[PDB]
Design a protein around this ligand. Sequence first.
Ligand SMILES: [Ca+2]
Ligand SMILES: [Ca+2]
Ligand SMILES: [Ca+2]
Ligand SMILES: [Zn+2]
Ligand SMILES: [Zn+2]
Length: 162
Amino acid sequence: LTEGNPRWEQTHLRYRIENYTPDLPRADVDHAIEKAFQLWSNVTPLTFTKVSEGQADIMISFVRGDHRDNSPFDGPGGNLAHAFQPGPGIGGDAHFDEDERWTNNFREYNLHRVAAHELGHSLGLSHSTDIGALMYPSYTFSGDVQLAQDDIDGIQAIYGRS
Ligand SMILES: [Ca+2]
Ligand SMILES: [Ca+2]
Ligand SMILES: [Ca+2]
Ligand SMILES: [Zn+2]
Ligand SMILES: [Zn+2]
């Protein structure tokens, strides 16, 4: 018996940012998130619509400590965020630890760089063993956040090419 990995059957997904971190003005947050989805849709037939309310496949929220799911946060440092694999309810949701200081620059914990990674999970990717890949578990930032060939091959193996 062989089991496949969690996938979205549709290629058009809806997302919603439930709340905003006080760390950045709302404009920066929206842009960091929108830009992260754009990285993935660029290499696949996947499209993402942002809904301001109502149903959404990918629910994005900034929380801290125990937030009713089964992977509570740990305060500053350590785990910065986590996202769930495709599926109903929690499936596809991305959670960011409010206890971290989220930024829009080189200062530790650039939101966009982390969002790009967790969104990889929301679409079905697991971690990579390549320190150069976006799907690597460790926080790394060089100013620019682009997909490594490993992330590209990974996502395309599931959804196909653009
Ligand atoms: Ca933390
Ligand atoms: Ca969901
Ligand atoms: Ca914060
Ligand atoms: Zn969570
Ligand atoms: Zn991860």
